[PDB]
Amino acid sequence: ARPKLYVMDNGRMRMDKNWMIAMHNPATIHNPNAQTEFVEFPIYTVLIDHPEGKILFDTSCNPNSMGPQGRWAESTQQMFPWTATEECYLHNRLEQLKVRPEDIRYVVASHLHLDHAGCLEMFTNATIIVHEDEFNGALQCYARNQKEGAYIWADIDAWIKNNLQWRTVKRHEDNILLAEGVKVLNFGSGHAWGMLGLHVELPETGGIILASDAIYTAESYGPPIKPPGIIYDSLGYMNTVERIRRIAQETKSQVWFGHDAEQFKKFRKSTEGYYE
Amino acid sequence: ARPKLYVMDNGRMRMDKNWMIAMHNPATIHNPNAQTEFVEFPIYTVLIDHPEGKILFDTSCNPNSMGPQGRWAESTQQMFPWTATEECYLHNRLEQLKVRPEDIRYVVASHLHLDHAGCLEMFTNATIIVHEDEFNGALQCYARNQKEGAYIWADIDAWIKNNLQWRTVKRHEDNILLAEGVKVLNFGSGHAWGMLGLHVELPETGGIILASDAIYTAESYGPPIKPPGIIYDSLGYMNTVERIRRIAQETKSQVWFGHDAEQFKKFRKSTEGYYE
Amino acid sequence: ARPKLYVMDNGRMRMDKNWMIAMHNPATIHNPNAQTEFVEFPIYTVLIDHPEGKILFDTSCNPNSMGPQGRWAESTQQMFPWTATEECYLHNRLEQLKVRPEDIRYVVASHLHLDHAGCLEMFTNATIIVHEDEFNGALQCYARNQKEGAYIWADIDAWIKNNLQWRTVKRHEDNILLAEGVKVLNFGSGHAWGMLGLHVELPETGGIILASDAIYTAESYGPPIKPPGIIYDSLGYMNTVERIRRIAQETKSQVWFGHDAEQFKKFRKSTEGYYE
Amino acid sequence: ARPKLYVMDNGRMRMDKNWMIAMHNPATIHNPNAQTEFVEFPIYTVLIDHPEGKILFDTSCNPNSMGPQGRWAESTQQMFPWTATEECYLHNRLEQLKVRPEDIRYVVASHLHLDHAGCLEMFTNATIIVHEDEFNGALQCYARNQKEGAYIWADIDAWIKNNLQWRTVKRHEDNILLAEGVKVLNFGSGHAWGMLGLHVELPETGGIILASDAIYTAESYGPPIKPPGIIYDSLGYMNTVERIRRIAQETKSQVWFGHDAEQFKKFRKSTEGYYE
Amino acid sequence: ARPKLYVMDNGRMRMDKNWMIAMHNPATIHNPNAQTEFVEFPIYTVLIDHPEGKILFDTSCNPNSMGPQGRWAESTQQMFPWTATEECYLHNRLEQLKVRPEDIRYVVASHLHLDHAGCLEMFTNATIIVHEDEFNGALQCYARNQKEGAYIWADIDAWIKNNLQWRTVKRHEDNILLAEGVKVLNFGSGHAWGMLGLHVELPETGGIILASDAIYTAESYGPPIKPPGIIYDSLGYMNTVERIRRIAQETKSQVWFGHDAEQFKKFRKSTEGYYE
Amino acid sequence: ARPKLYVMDNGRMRMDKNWMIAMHNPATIHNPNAQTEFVEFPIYTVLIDHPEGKILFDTSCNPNSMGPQGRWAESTQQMFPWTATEECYLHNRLEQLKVRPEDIRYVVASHLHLDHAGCLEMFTNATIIVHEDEFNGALQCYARNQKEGAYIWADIDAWIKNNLQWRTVKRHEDNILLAEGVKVLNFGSGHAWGMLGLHVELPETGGIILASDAIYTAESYGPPIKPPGIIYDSLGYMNTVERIRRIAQETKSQVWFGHDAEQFKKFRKSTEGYYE
Ligand SMILES: CCCCCCCCCC(=O)CC(=O)N[C@H]1CCOC1=O
Ligand SMILES: CCCCCCCCCC(=O)CC(=O)N[C@H]1CCOC1=O
Ligand SMILES: CCCCCCCCCC(=O)CC(=O)N[C@H]1CCOC1=O
Ligand SMILES: CCCCCCCCCC(=O)CC(=O)N[C@H]1CCOC1=O
Ligand SMILES: CCCCCCCCCC(=O)CC(=O)N[C@H]1CCOC1=O
Ligand SMILES: CCCCCCCCCC(=O)CC(=O)N[C@H]1CCOC1=O
Ligand SMILES: [Co+2]
Ligand SMILES: [Co+2]
Ligand SMILES: [Co+2]
Ligand SMILES: [Co+2]
Ligand SMILES: [Co+2]
Ligand SMILES: [Co+2]
Ligand SMILES: [Fe+3]
Ligand SMILES: [Fe+3]
Ligand SMILES: [Fe+3]
Ligand SMILES: [Fe+3]
Ligand SMILES: [Fe+3]
Ligand SMILES: [Fe+3]
Description:
Pfam families (chains A, B, C, D, E, F): Lactamase_B
Bound molecules: N-3-OXO-dodecanoyl-L-homoserine lactone, cobalt (II) ion, fe (iii) ion
Structural class of chain A: alpha/beta
InterPro entries (chains A, B, C, D, E, F): MBL_superfamily_lactonases (IPR051013), Metallo-B-lactamas (IPR001279), RibonucZ/Hydroxyglut_hydro (IPR036866)
Protein name (chains A, B, C, D, E, F): Putative hydrolase
Oligomer: homohexamer
Keywords (chains A, B, C, D, E, F): Hydrolase, Metal-binding, Zinc
Shape of chain A: globular
Domain Metallo-beta-lactamase (chains A, B, C, D, E, F): 42-259
């Protein structure tokens, strides 16, 4: 297999850095009203054009997320503002590669947060691979009519109405060989209820681990590890980071973080090329 | 048994409110430089004058904690400054009750943070009851010569030099009946590596749960639960709070939080009287 | 507390006895085309009129289950036909007791099968108590647009649209004291993904265990245990039956089965009276 | 290693199809007396003539199983009748290959049901590899003098009298490398108390998974999975099937089912040749 | 209920003290050939004459254990010699109380060692309660034709021939209420594969814990704990001792050790009376 | 990589054989005062001179262990006397190889017993790899001021004073790839609280497993396994031995025992050469 891997730029988000790095700048006796920072970071997705079929990792934000008629609650829009030109919409990024949503065989959902599962509803011809615990959690949000938070009611509503085809990764399930040199990593609970990663073995580029929000940035990764300001399973989060570090060492793989602005700038984007 | 329970005021501490309540005031697009605050809370201990023997819950901060010649690292002093008059020192609070350290049969260490284990070194004639995971973690800090953090090297140094007598509560150990109507609750991992609580049944007052840092404040308790800005085991923390809520319901017990300023002000202090 | 407990007759169902008792009559060399039986059994619910608030255990079938315009798939209607006069509808049974749906404080859903969770949508003023694993499973059925089976898409649709208030019993959660002498038993996985039971302690009647489909009938119960023809967690099912037997012995409680025609006939129904 | 693999025909069995496929033909309102059928399936064993030593997988039924003087209880004979010519007896099948029981180094007992462990007593010069949970269960049947069921008292009696040499596979034991390209798969609880499979890697044929009763037939395998009418551990059974499906995918292995009539007919029998 | 509890003297055993207390007298540079000692200890059983039925705890050694025609292997006889007069045989001890074997409702087998399970074969009218792991272990000894060790082949042979009625305590099974004030304690693995204890609440005497070999002697009990020279599950053993210590404290119960010569001297034997 | 592996002779120890092999010579009716023996065995360490960095496995005893001014308690010196010439001190063994302590990158502590962790304090430039459970246990010994036993207070004191850099292997952590063909095996609890082994793949010599005290001698190894006279976790110990047996078979590796005098005689020592 001689696949091509694309990094697609799906815009920028901003939020309190305390979300990204817990207690990054604590108040002190001489600085008791310490102020935080409003940091900008990239939202991106990865397409693997594989001979066995096209694989998509994450789906960024829904084009109708922001605005007064948006899907995101006002509170969400104010705390996690997403900025994207039409060019940045996943549909458009794929189109520019002559890829239609119906051409996607597998979508790997790292998790079901607003900035990763926004465009799942588009892929009605794919098998959507998601952690069963993440799926369960999101559905509870939906059933409980939770309108605020990182799980977008309107997005979930759309997944159901569009009759997506789901394959859940069970809590105690081994990693999944999706195709030659493409492995779905079952990270389990940490950042969210259930995290999935990807290990890609490219002929000329070698090993790549897509960590998503298992590791926000190089600052998160360290060492030492700097966990995010809010977290589902702290123990699971720390275990997952260490696990990724081990896999990276043993397989001589690069680790691609969820939202590292510096790393993202160095990526070859879909407007410039790909990784073979 | 007709026991007397005393609440002893061991001064005040201040810190970033984000420590207490995670992401209490997140930055927004309109408030991108959102400032935190430096909140003040009480440090206190509880003495149970029981016919079977005096039981002490927590030990506050060491009198030699703060200052240029202090045991606390300068960074620790600036992030978590402790203010206390001489009358606030545990040794002094006990003396006013005509109680000598040598008189204490049991000391229950909720955990070994600087604001709870400060004066353990005093009680050389007692059995020190602590969670085995907490003890292990603290000892690792010592062995690794960790100077910064919530575990004070000089304090641990003194515990060893004073040849304290330890009984560790095992990770999977049942609750311990210390005395008639006094039970050590094995909360396990959460806020710290290993948390212990206390349930006291007084003839007149009824049930009291000493939660310590298992629950910082009423705001923490909710519902809904508002967890602290940092946390060892998030899942364990949440489980522990809900467990306490259940025990309180089933036993019709009051819940005494670790550091609730408003609750503390309503307590009858050792200088005014006791509970029976 | 001097509560009154009512048994409400919510009609009759029929199905292959092999569903109820696995391999009840296996084919043999001399009877190779052994035929099954189509057995009839009661659907019922229990109301506990408690001074602390009214508690409802199970909700039977939705009045619009059967028929060409019914909610149940044709296949379901043919395999599990429900027969009920208007008098048998839960709404009507409650009305005859001068109880309105909005008067119900707690609904305990043993599980979310079609014959137990049919009328959940009515109780918009209650807290609905359900096993988290059962809730998760049902929601997946909904999200996956599963139209056939024991989980009714239309029913689930209604729960969400009616904005029911859910309290999920966690997989490893202790039993819940709902009110004086009313305990929700966390049976876990067996018959379905997550089973809840009830133990009621009545002043004059004594102990009652509501087992629901944890135990179909006296034939199921034995001894020896005769498990149902289809089952989620066989090991969990067997463990649960034995657990109920132990609780029954230790608390001298009656066991009320899910669908025992003989036992049901002996019950004092809501048209005759109640249990104090 | 250039091993030869032989498939040995050990006759036919019949039973209620409901045993094979649970609720295969449920009663309906239009067919309330739905009849089952008495399906016929093969009993077979596999001999691996390996340079490191001959390995036998399963041992079929004891030649003294059926008849008025038979080891099988009359009830067992009528529910699971076994038909076999003399040429079908394992001892005879081996003799035709010029293989004596004393020549067998290893016998892998998938489990200890009457149709798999029938002739263990023959192999007194071999190490008998069996799951420890299966061995324990079988021995309990013996000790409890259980005359009915799938565990034949007289067979077990003979194992003990013939002083067979056992190696039990522990519940949490890794797969066992028996010989070059021969691995015992520890499937654990499911169909029975403890299931063992085999993965064979042949130079010419490639990968073969002997699943035995972990998967009865292609119908069982699906997807979707159609489980048997009775089952020890339903969760374990489902997990095992999916595990086998994964192993088959990852190793590009064929899956040989326990009792698939159509698959068996396509096999090259020991009377025609072997696999290499 | 007003039961009578009898202690029955079933003779004396001797063995290397190192069996009783591990490394009781280690070799030193000044004593490199350190000598052990051959200590004597009692074998005893407990009959609870309960209004609900007679309960027997342990059964001592089989009368045909010792001698050239004895069931015990020569090595066993030389390492663990049992000395008992005819009066000491359990059958005779019972007969002198006007109790026939057929009169026993329940036999609780602490474990199946030669000195506890010797006379099980007598009680063909009782339910024999044993830990499932202990039962499995013993049966494997039998099936493997182990004619040496602490599990007597001939004894096990007799259990099966005499068609004893077994009720196994499952590994993760709760304590069993056998009768008013009589509870079987599920100790689990430790001394052996599966240990059972008994807690008896007598109206006049109060609480008694029958520890059997969970605790050999007061020396074993300490504290500190001094474990035996050979042990199946060291961690389980230690946990069990501490569990017994807790139960004893919480229930104000006496602990009756397995083989404490000094304690056994102080008991009232069946020749002088009983405990009420 | 072309590493050189050195076996360094760090003297001889003697102790009661009962420590090495539990109940090796039990008392009998004809030998009631059976004598033990005082057996001698080697203390040794392994240096892997790897291109990626020098790796040291174990560190033998501290040079100031024995004598009236020694670190070892008198009781310890008499029970476990260590005899070593100056040439046998690790520091000198290393010096003769032109290796300074500061030259060591990694020290793998199999465990922290007196005969393995004696010279840890020398390697202030290395990362010290130890099992977290072993580390915790030793530190508790120190904090509890245990001045007897297999954990040397003065040794631990020195580790902390010398500011060693620790990397703890977590209880549920995978094996660690330390360098090309060098893997730390996480054996877990058994002989001690937490055992670490090493697997080395040498280009010329092939596979070597350093078992340390996971397996004392070939007699320990069997089969059958003959466990030591004292043991932390008997089940863990047995599991570990069998695990090592499996690894050895699957990787065609030699197993180097902790203290096998006969095996150690056959090794090439650092005075004669090395293994490539
Ligand atoms: C009840 C609503 C509370 C509002 C805050 C809760 C949001 C959950 C915290 C979180 O994970 C924020 C988030 O989803 N951030 C994105 C941005 C980077 O990757 C993320 O996870
Ligand atoms: C780089 C280490 C030093 C930075 C401090 C991080 C340790 C924070 C641990 C924590 O939970 C803070 C703390 O101990 N707070 C006190 C105040 C209230 O009760 C507490 O635990
Ligand atoms: C894909 C649809 C398959 C149709 C059969 C599946 C139904 C699940 C089996 C079952 O539990 C039937 C059921 O729900 N029966 C009711 C009647 C008595 O209590 C019950 O659980
Ligand atoms: C009352 C006990 C006797 C009734 C028989 C019940 C045992 C059924 C166990 C089973 O799974 C049937 C069985 O062994 N079938 C064979 C045929 C195919 O492979 C098998 O396991
Ligand atoms: C090293 C050869 C010994 C032969 C194997 C016999 C196993 C002995 C282990 C044991 O526990 C002996 C035993 O059962 N002793 C009785 C006597 C006191 O209570 C006992 O457990
Ligand atoms: C019964 C009094 C003994 C004093 C306590 C010392 C503990 C001895 C336990 C042990 O394992 C001794 C030890 O560490 N021996 C060394 C020598 C061989 O490898 C070892 O483990
Ligand atoms: Co996220
Ligand atoms: Co704290
Ligand atoms: Co149901
Ligand atoms: Co079978
Ligand atoms: Co014993
Ligand atoms: Co050691
Ligand atoms: Fe994100
Ligand atoms: Fe605190
Ligand atoms: Fe039902
Ligand atoms: Fe079969
Ligand atoms: Fe004994
Ligand atoms: Fe050693």
